[PDB]
Amino acid sequence: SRRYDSRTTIFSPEGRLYQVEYAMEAIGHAGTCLGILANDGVLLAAERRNIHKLLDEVFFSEKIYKLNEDMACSVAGITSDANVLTNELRLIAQRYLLQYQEPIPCEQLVTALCDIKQAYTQFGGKRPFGVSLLYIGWDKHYGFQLYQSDPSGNYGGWKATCIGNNSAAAVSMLKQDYKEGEMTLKSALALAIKVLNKTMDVSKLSAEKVEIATLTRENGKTVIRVLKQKEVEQLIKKHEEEEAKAEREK
Amino acid sequence: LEGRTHIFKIHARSMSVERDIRFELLARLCPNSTGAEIRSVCTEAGMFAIRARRKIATEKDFLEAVNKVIKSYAKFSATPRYMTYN
């Protein structure tokens, strides 16, 4: 009864963990997200993996999961493990609100989920969670935030994020087009449109294959704007006219 | 224990060393080791003597050789899975 045992916890004799890296290489496929925090708001971007013509789009949601009033998360990896994670995460934030009657700050939420993931990395032989996922949100102490979960339990705040293997060049692009706090909400959207236009190899970026949701700060509302498709269309037209204006320099 | 003392006497009898040193302390740091590793210790202590320009070994040369062979390449070491005779 031990020769069948798969040993997904014991270190490898190369020097690192073994199953952890392969969960990372399971992150690398089927997924490509980022967001752009650079004032008054923060956004998320997403690629349709099932962009087939025979779906319904009746969920009024996609990759985004509004997990509270003031936080959502973008998924990349195996989807339904993340549903297990979103249910547990939503329930964690809601029990915190039950305990204090004040909304949940974003880093102890992230560290709670990171301790859950490390709890299945550390002991037993259980299969690790093959899900990395993002975080947007608001607090009383820092404003708008961005966080990067990893299947190890390691996290890290960013100002311009990355999950999927197609988006490492996006991080190169985010550095080459880095701004010091300039999110008028049209500049950041045009930059995100430019990034997803270049990094995905889908020619000219059909707007049904993308997804953009924003989070702005209102006094009593903290609205999360999972925006509709027409503004995405005119955003694509704006960016393609600006690419035609930009290649007048040749 | 005494086997490695004698194998140090074997690999050491025809080489340029400082005979004022001991060999028992060298054998006490090699609990699970083969004669091949002993030979590597002797030769590598010589090779550390070639780093400087000397004609006689020192005790420190052999200590460099021990912590160079055994503790460093003990990740490979060839006998944690042949002592069980897999």
Binding site: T8, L54, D56, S80, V84 | -
Partner: protein, 232 residues
């Protein structure tokens, strides 16, 4: 039961869940099916061949209701199908205890997908070899939800699962549209089931259930025998 509790499910060197890929192949080796949503109702249809001329067609049932307005078929192995059917039964009644209201189909698919995903993580057990097609008419708009062994789920306008799902799907892309009636849905469903089955299709080789906004309804071999006049 013994203290092992270890998951036999391991990622590949590449990063792939080999037991889920194999479970998808085991789904693909099963009996074909098709299910179509068409403006007023949802039609499910399976393909139920007896091995001999000896077998009875009144004992085993593919189309199976979960509540009074929620139908459910599969394409895979019946021995796992009945288990997770029974689980969905017990699960829907806790919702109706809590809220005193019939459960929405999206909430069923959430909870069933949570169960199946949570079970493929769980230790010393194989995944289910079953892909579902769940449907129902909740709050006016009817729905259709396909799941899979990997725990995921989708929402379709028309789809198929089983043998020659690719051929049936290429027939569905050409054949279906936005707006039909229930009868035309039955027409295109028996057409795409007639795409892959054997030549003799009778009141018993198929087994068809519908959904109205007035509730779920499981059709009989009487109306099935009524329907295959000017067949497909």
């Amino acid at each position: 039961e013994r203290g092992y509790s270890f998951s036999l499910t391991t990622f590949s060197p590449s990063g792939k869940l080999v037991q889920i890929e194999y479970a998808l192949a085991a789904v693909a080796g099963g009996a074909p099916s098709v299910g179509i949503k068409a403006a007023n109702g949802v039609v499910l249809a399976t393909e139920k061949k007896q091995k001999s001329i000896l077998y009875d067609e009144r004992s085993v049932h593919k189309v199976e209701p979960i509540t009074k307005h929620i139908g459910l078929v599969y394409s895979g192995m019946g021995p796992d199908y009945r288990v997770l059917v029974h689980r969905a039964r017990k699960l829907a009644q806790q919702y109706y205890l809590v809220y005193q209201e019939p459960i929405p189909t999206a909430q069923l698919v959430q909870r069933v997908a949570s169960v199946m995903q949570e079970y493929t993580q769980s230790g010393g057990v194989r995944p289910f070899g079953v892909s579902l097609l769940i449907c129902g008419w909740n709050e006016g708009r009817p729905y259709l939800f396909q799941s899979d062994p990997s725990g995921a789920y989708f929402a379709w306008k028309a789809t198929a699962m089983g043998k020659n799902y690719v051929n049936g799907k290429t027939f569905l892309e050409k054949r279906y549209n936005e707006d039909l009636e229930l009868e035309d849905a039955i027409h295109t469903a028996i057409l795409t089931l007639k795409e892959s089955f054997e030549g003799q299709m009778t009141e018993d080789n198929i087994e068809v259930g519908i959904c109205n906004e007035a509730g779920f309804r499981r059709l009989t071999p009487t109306e099935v025998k009524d329907y295959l006049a000017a067949i497909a």
